[PDB]
Design a protein around this ligand. Structure first.
Ligand SMILES: O=C(O)/C(=C/c1ccc(Oc2ccccc2Br)cc1)NC(=O)c1ccccc1
Ligand SMILES: [Cl-]
Length: 564
């Protein structure tokens, strides 16, 4: 019976200026024309989110819980993690990461400046000596762009982000980076989502579904998961980590960060005021993704048992959960789901929207996406992942009319390269603007599984072939429902129909070829679809020449991570 937060009454304030509406760009209109449906969240709506994330939590454990837990620990005891040298940790820090409140920022930290490495060592030392004093944190209102839509009733309030000082963040890396990059797959195997790349996730979902006599799957939407995490859940996560083979120093740092940071602590707004007290999951620490994934999996696996699901397979990504199993008849399936929901609720994890059995894999949404079909060169049936393009396009627009240090369009192109909208619009629109400014060589940052990466457009052809397979460049004969969903979206926002883009694609793939080099390798592989005349595409040379491990190994959302 512990509230997830307590509030002092002080407002959540912003630091920088917050743009609510879309500007007045002319390229932005080349993408979207209904600019009034696009919008960003601001600290103005922060109090509404506060209401939502604030509630009492009731939790009642049971034998199924302890059993699964015990099983997890067993698997964890087979994991050995190392500490990260201050230097190593410092490098995993993002150039733009929020500056330390102790005078010094990201570059200072990244360049191993004296001052920074000093404070960091002090903070570390302090963790080893003090194990109880709650570490201070800052709470801001996130600013993300969405599309207005009355079906839901208007606008979504801003999300909240709770994080500790830069000094602390580096310590987290040192004491837990190896754990959160290895412990997950160790305990849950195939159920751990972040070990898969697009091509792998698709293959995993499809195969699991087809392995069932009569498949039945459901996604579980938890009402504000982070707020449902209890102090006991976080302490349990800690015990799991401790099952690892660690250094005595790492153990003490983990216990201290757990008791002083993870379980809870005071929060101040940007103006340094006492905002409230947190007794749930911090949204902006290193263990957020790892912790939610472990806790979601724990409750869900125990819930499955109370529900008696048959031959069930789980796929967990943070709080995002999808379960596939053998059906026991439609009525039994519904009842089993209501029990699963009852056990989750008991484990302190009720749902927002109630789960519903689904018997069509393509009608299931997990990780904001669904499986769909298309065909390859030899007309072979190819499965891929997609989603409604609305948000991606509203954001793709916004980033065209306003500068964003971290875009999303490029990320979406990487995550959804095989989709119709990605290939024909995003790809087209962006190589267009690039060319009109000569920046095809300039790298830009985008996030993948929460981690930051500096990527160069010129490499998409390889990146893409790696993540989705060569077929991704020749997919055709997309399912009508998918083709319909898109065109429906375009007409809703003001985006020229696929035809207007099929035009530009040639008009663009042209200027790209009459440039050879790398810009050529692209315009050929990425736009082979926009030409009746189709030249044969084969394994790209430097498709292998490039390290891509770090990419799909674990989740780091909210973890302030950067990879090179
Ligand atoms: O922030 C996160 O933690 C994050 C998690 C996440 C979990 C699972 C997932 O599965 C899919 C779903 C569809 C296609 C391929 C894959 Br692998 C994708 C993302 N989002 C991005 O990485 C992300 C990056 C760019 C664009 C959008 C999201
Ligand atoms: Cl269809």
């Amino acid at each position: 019976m512990s509230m997830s937060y307590t509030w002092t009454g002080a407002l959540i304030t912003p630091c920088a200026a917050e743009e609510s509406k879309l500007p007045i760009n002319a390229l932005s209109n080349s993408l979207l024309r209904h600019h009034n449906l696009v919008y960003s969240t601001t600290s103005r709506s922060a109090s509404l989110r506060q209401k939502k994330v604030t509630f009492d939590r009731l939790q009642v454990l049971d034998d199924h819980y302890r059993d699964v837990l015990k099983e997890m620990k067993a698997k964890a005891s087979t994991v050995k993690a190392k500490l990260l040298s201050v230097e190593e940790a410092c490098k995993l820090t993002p150039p733009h990461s929020a500056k330390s409140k102790f005078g010094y920022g990201a570059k200072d930290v990244r360049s191993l400046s004296s001052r920074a490495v000093n404070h960091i060592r002090s903070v570390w030392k302090d963790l080893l000596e003090d194990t109880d004093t709650p570490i201070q944190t800052t709470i801001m209102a996130k600013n993300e762009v969405f599309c207005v839509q009355p079906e839901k009733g208007g606008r979504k309030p801003a999300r909240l982000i709770v994080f500790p000082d830069l000094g602390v963040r580096v310590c987290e890396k040192m004491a837990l980076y190896d754990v959160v990059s290895t412990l997950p797959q160790a305990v849950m195997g195939s159920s751990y989502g972040f070990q898969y790349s697009p091509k792998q996730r698709v293959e995993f979902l499809v195969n699991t579904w087809k392995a069932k006599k009569c498949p039945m799957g459901f996604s579980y939407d938890t009402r504000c998961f982070d707020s449902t995490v209890t102090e006991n859940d976080i302490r349990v996560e800690e015990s799991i980590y401790q099952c690892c083979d660690l250094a005595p120093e790492a153990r003490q740092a983990i216990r201290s960060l757990t008791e002083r940071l993870y379980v809870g602590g005071p929060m101040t707004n940007s103006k340094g005021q006492n905002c409230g007290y947190r007794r749930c999951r911090a949204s902006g620490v290193l263990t957020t993704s790892c912790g939610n994934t472990l806790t979601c999996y724990l409750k869900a696996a125990a819930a499955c048992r109370a529900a008696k699901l048959q031959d069930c397979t789980m796929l967990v990504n943070g709080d995002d959960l999808v379960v596939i199993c053998e059906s026991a008849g439609t009525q039994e399936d519904a009842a089993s789901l209501r029990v699963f929901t009852e056990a989750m609720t008991r484990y302190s994890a009720p749902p927002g929207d109630p789960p519903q059995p689904e018997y069509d894999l393509e009608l299931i949404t997990s990780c904001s996406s669904n499986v769909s079909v298309a065909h390859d060169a030899s007309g072979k049936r190819v499965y891929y992942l997609t989603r409604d393009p609305t948000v991606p396009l509203a954001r793709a627009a916004w980033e065209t009319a306003r500068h964003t240090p971290v875009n999303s369009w490029l990320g979406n192109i990487i995550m959804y390269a095989p989709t119709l909208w990605a290939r024909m619009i995003l790809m087209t629109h962006f190589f267009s603007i690039l060319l009109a400014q000569e920046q095809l060589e300039k790298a830009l940052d985008c996030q993948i599984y929460g981690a930051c990466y500096s990527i160069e457009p010129l490499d998409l052809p390889q990146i893409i072939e790696r993540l989705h397979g060569l077929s991704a460049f020749s997919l055709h004969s997309y399912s009508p429902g998918e083709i319909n969903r898109v065109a429906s979206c375009l007409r809703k926002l003001g985006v020229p129909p696929l035809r207007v883009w099929r035009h530009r694609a040639r008009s663009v793939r042209a200027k790209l070829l009459s440039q050879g080099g790398r810009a050529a390798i692209c315009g050929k592989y990425l736009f082979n679809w926009a030409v009746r005349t189709k030249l044969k595409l084969t394994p790209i040379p430097a498709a292998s020449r490039l390290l891509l491990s770090g990419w799909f190994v674990a989740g780091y959302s909210g973890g302030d991570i950067y990879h090179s």
